[PDB]
RNA sequence: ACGGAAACCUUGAUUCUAACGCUACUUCUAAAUAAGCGUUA
């Protein structure tokens, strides 16, 4: 989206939301990702950032 | 020492019976708690 002070993403490129008088066209409402069953704290470590 | 005197337009009566402010309607739609590590030493 170049119509602005600095560029940003075009959120309307993949259509989402309801439209007035138009058929519902949300693709990523059809993809529904559930979360995980909780795992244990025995699987956790204390890593550090290296660049 | 009057066409005059005496005489309640009065008694008893429920503006009452029956009737759902009800029927239908997702607070809904997309969205990684994530990005940047320069320069000096």
Swiss-Prot record:
Source taxon at top rank: Bacteria
Disulfide bonds: none
Main function: CRISPR (clustered regularly interspaced short palindromic repeat) is an adaptive immune system that provides protection against mobile genetic elements (viruses, transposable elements and conjugative plasmids). CRISPR clusters contain spacers, sequences complementary to antecedent mobile elements, and target invading nucleic acids. CRISPR clusters are transcribed and processed into CRISPR RNA (crRNA). Csm functions as a non-specific ssDNase. Base-pairing between crRNA and target RNA to form a ternary Csm complex activates a ssDNase activity; target RNA cleavage suppresses the ssDNase, a temporal control that prevents uncontrolled DNA degradation. Viral RNA transcripts probably tether the Csm complex to the viral genome, recruiting Cas10 ssDNA activity which is able to degrade DNA in the transcription bubble, spatially controlling the DNase activity.
Family designation: Belongs to the CRISPR-associated Csm5 family.
Comment field (misc): Encoded in a type III-A CRISPR locus.
Subunit composition and interactions: Part of the Csm effector complex that includes at least Cas10(1), Csm2(3), Csm3(5), Csm4(1), Csm5(1) and mature crRNA. The Csm complex is elongated and slightly twisted with a maximal length of 215 Angstroms and a diameter of 75-80 Angstroms. It has been modeled to have a central protein filamant of Csm3 subunits along which the dsRNA helix of paired crRNA and target RNA binds. The filament is capped at one end by Cas10 and Csm4 and at the other end by Csm5; ssDNA is thought to bind to the N-terminal HD domain of Cas10.
Protein name, per record: CRISPR system Cms protein Csm5
Species of the source: Streptococcus thermophilus
Taxonomy of the source species: Bacteria, Bacillati, Bacillota, Bacilli, Lactobacillales
Residue span relative to the full protein: 154 to 204 of 357
């Amino acid at each position: 989206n170049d119509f602005g002070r600095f560029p940003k993403e075009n959120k309307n490129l993949i259509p989402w939301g309801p439209k007035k008088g138009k058929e519902y066209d949300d693709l990523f409402n059809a993809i529904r990702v559930s979360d995980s069953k909780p795992f244990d704290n025995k699987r956790l470590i204390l890593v550090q950032k290296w660049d």
